[PDB]
Amino acid sequence: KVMVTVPDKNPPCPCCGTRVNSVLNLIEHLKVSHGKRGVCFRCAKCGKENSNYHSVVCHFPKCRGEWICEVCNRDFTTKIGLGQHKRLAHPAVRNQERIVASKKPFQKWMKDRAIKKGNYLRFQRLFYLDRGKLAKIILDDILSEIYSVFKTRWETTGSFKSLGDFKTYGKADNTAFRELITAKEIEKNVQEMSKGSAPGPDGITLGDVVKMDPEFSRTMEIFNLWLTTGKIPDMVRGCRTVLIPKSSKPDRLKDINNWRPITIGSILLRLFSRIVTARLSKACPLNPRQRGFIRAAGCSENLKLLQTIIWSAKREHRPLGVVFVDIAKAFDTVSHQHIIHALQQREVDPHIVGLVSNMYENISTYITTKRNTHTDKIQIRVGVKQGDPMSPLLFNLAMDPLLCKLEESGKGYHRGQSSITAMAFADDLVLLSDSWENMNTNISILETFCNLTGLKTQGQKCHGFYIKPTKDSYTINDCAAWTINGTPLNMIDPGESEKYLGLQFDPWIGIARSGLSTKLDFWLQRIDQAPLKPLQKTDILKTYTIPRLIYIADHSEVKTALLETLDQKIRTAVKEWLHLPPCTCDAILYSSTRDGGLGITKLAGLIPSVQARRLHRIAQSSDDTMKCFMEKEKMEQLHKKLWIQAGGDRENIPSIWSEWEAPTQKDKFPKPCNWRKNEFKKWTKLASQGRGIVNFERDKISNHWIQYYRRIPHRKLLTALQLRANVYPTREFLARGRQDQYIKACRHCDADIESCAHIIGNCPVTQDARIKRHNYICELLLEEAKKKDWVVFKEPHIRDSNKELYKPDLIFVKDARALVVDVTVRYEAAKSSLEEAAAEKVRKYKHLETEVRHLTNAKDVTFVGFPLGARGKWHQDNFKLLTELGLSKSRQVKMAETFSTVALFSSVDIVHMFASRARKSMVM
DNA sequence: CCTTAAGAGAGTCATAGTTACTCCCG
DNA sequence: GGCATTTGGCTAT
RNA sequence: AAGGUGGACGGGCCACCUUUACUUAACCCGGAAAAGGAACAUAUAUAAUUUAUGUGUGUUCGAUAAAUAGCCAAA
DNA sequence: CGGGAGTAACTATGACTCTCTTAAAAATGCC
Ligand SMILES: Cc1cn([C@H]2C[C@H](O)[C@@H](COP(=O)(O)OP(=O)(O)OP(=O)(O)O)O2)c(=O)[nH]c1=O
Ligand SMILES: [Mg+2]
Ligand SMILES: [Zn+2]
Ligand SMILES: [Zn+2]
Ligand SMILES: [Zn+2]
Ligand SMILES: [Zn+2]
């Protein structure tokens, strides 16, 4: 890296030995003239280095063992410190020690111009057609074989023989199938279906079903005919198959097993399957160990349960075995006769079992690939369809007797009177044991079930570890590896980790190191290197990039220091994209878009409230056995800490401890505090950058341009953002607090303070621009007066009784009414500024009643002031004038947005004019 | 036509309090 | 052609 | 050296020329940047590896990927 | 094998000191 030594505020460039004005001008010269993005700064007193300049200048004023680690030559004073160092910094060395102690002519440069213009065209096209694909392209860098493998996979009947001694969780409730399908039940399920999904081979989509049959009458007769006959017709049995990749890496895409066959059926069959699955899910209660596809947040509960069990086994000095398995090709391998036998064990109503058997009786499908080429027609004789609404319920009913057997005769891990042998989330299964030899009993139960039903386990995803207590602390994997189907398992050694439900588990520490920082750096660099405009980059970060962090940051329980590190990185990236000064307030970034902000998410505000709500959600779970393994006191103390740290009230903390037509209901657990309104409240308390911000608090009209900025140039947008934050670089802003060395006077006149209010409102160099602004606003109001057939006396000359001259802008005459309107554009600096502006523009002409009467031959005369804010404030009382003119309710809102946008960007034009006549006059 | 100001954030560094242990006598 | 209305992301399997 | 145009535009930097001429390789930063690019289909021509070579004219470079749950945000 | 006593590296709060130039809306639905 290029190395710069900084005690001195003005160093030279090392590429040419030539000095500049400041370190910021050096970074400018290194970036532009040489492309040297890798810069490192050194403290002159002590030789400390960092990549960050501001680190080194904060370093400069404050600038000032008998026992040896055999791994890294670190030195320590006591052996206790050495053992603690080897515990923290060197896992699996300490573990071994604990075990041991037990049409121009040519075409050349125009090609490069064509490539650059084409890259810009592609990204600007995708920003307005499909922004989700643009986010994926920025962030993620993403015939005979298919026919032969999938044809030999699907066509052969599975190897199920019999369930044997395996028994399901209780008998069924046959009352659910009694009452007929109503049209409102169909309406509720159509509201709960996915909104924009693909059609089947018959080509009808869900919106077409609504258009063909609005009241759901015809589909009701069709679905009840299917339900009482108990057989589906042959016209829906055909399906299509589309392949989805399982991993983004090109190293994996050649292998056929990393492609997932998604089978899509008819829309009416799919809706009918969801309607039947609701009733069959009511009829068949599952074993509570199964947390996948049910109406619960199973991921949070399973991660919390595994984390608490791993922590508690260490703290109570008890042995604990953990094994992770999952089923290979889980939906594709399950036999139809297995599902039918599982339904018959429950004594489900035989008409319903006949219907379920009939729906899988003659399914056939064809695979499409290479965008529009198809293979044959393949009989589906094994497996449920991935993408049919009924298949998760059928897979859960097929996997239920294994979980019941593991509860019944598996040797689990105890706490008090209760025990846990198994945990399930879909096909993912975790086995727990209180001893090493007990896991062989659990594994042989799993082997017996896989031999009876014909299922198989993915050997690539079978892992495990064993914790064994000692006098002080514990050892990991001081044993032989377990074997499932002969092959030994991958025993997870300390310091290494494997995935479980998206997070990673390490036996040494629990839920492993997050790695969010490297992902955030990588994503910010890829957003920066896209050919996009700055607010487009800000929108890619705002909407798509930041929600990817929230699940991992929630469930791994990240504390505040890493959150504020990520927040610092985010807001430095945003302020460097938008060309804002580093001293710009945080609240323009963090307030809501209707508050006048950008709507970027503060992690240190959002994440502790999400974690606190997660703990409250887990504590009110219906799973009564999981709550007996919860560490009650640590959960209450952690909820208290997260409630206080999120900004909640210390004194009001919560304590955390027909049927077919009613819409689905959820509990909404209490939220600590509204952090975004707290950001806006601390914006209004600033002295200079918060001046007049209270005008824009909930005005959806004045902040319309921050959302819909499409037809505005970005120079004008960034100057509007600088004028709203009051961080535009006039000389008053270049002084601020640094008052000893700089001049605050105006460049063009003798006025003492060169504020932005001086430039916009009062300075004599911008007088023609203010006159043209006022005239254009009066023309915009005049055309709306013309459109409703008002006769306009524009700019009269009225001489009063004392022969003084007055000039109102507009008089509007219709049906003996006369409306005297006077327009002004005031820079807003208080909550009451435009109201006083309207009052003083009323007060200027109120005596002129009778003169306006004989001028316009009118009977009734009213006088109205029409103020506008120079930074886009729409005054609320101007709707009275617009509704007296008689505009419709939508057209008033649209005109209000037009007036506010015109006033703001004409003030931007005034500020640009002042900057231009300032700069270009320097030579003459 | 217009009527005039008010540093804020980034960054280091010190103090002292948890967490998960380590090691040695009665 | 007036008038009104409404417009999102992410994770697990 | 000095006056110039050229590298879409502004700032750098480079190439070319000599009172407006020679004609242009290769690049950086940006608040500027909507195809003289790539894959195909198809007409036409030459010197048949014609599944060629050289031009022209049009499509595309996006969604067309389904399911069951859950969370966050606005409301 | 209980039970003091003692750390490494996080965590959580205050209290400072540092920095200050990139031109010339829109798609769908209803009256
Ligand atoms: C990931 C995924 C899974 N599923 C269902 C189908 C799967 O059979 C079941 C379990 O998924 P997985 O275990 O992730 O997939 P798999 O076991 O079928 O593939 P592999 O053997 O290579 O691991 O969840 C979906 O329906 N949609 C999805 O997007
Ligand atoms: Mg699987
Ligand atoms: Zn240099
Ligand atoms: Zn130093
Ligand atoms: Zn070491
Ligand atoms: Zn002035």
Residue numbers in the entry: 220 to 283, 293 to 330, 546 to 585, 594 to 1108, 1124 to 1390
What did the authors write?
R2 elements, a class of non-long terminal repeat (non-LTR) retrotransposons, have the potential to be harnessed for transgene insertion. To insert a new copy of itself, the R2 protein recruits the R2 RNA and nicks the bottom strand of the 28S DNA. Using the nicked DNA as a primer and the R2 RNA as a template, it reverse transcribes a new copy of the element – a process known as target-primed reverse transcription (TPRT). The R2Tg element is a member of the R2-A clade common in birds, with several differences compared to R2Bm, which is in the R2-D clade.
To understand differences in the DNA and RNA-binding properties of R2Tg and R2Bm, we incubated R2Tg protein with a biotinylated DNA substrate and 149 nt of 3′ UTR RNA + 40 nt of 3′ homology in the presence of dideoxythymidine to stall TPRT after reverse transcription of a single nucleotide. We purified stalled TPRT complexes using streptavidin beads and solved their structure by cryo-EM to 3.2 Å resolution. The nicked bottom strand is annealed to the RNA 3′ homology within the RT domain, and the 3′ UTR is bound by the RT − 1 domain. In the 325-nt R2Tg 3′ UTR, we similarly found two double-stranded regions with a single-stranded linker, but these were contiguous in sequence space, directly forming the 3′ 67 nt of the 3′ UTR, consistent with our TPRT assays on truncated substrates. The first of these double-stranded regions, equivalent to P1 in R2Bm, forms a pseudoknot with three base triples, resulting in the ordered region of the R2Tg 3′ UTR being larger and more extensive than the R2Bm 3′ UTR. The Myb domain, which binds the start of the RUM in R2Bm, was not resolved in our cryo-EM density despite being present in our expression construct. The ZnF domain in common with R2Bm (ZnF 1) inserts an alpha helix into the minor groove of the target DNA, similar to R2Bm, but forms hydrogen bonds to different bases. Therefore, although R2Tg and R2Bm bind to the same DNA substrate with similar DNA-binding domains, they read out different bases of the target using different residues from the same domains. The two additional N-terminal ZnF domains in R2Tg, characteristic of the R2-A clade of R2 elements, were not immediately apparent in our cryo-EM density. However, after low-pass filtering we were able to dock AlphaFold models of these domains above the minor groove of the target DNA between positions –12 to –9.
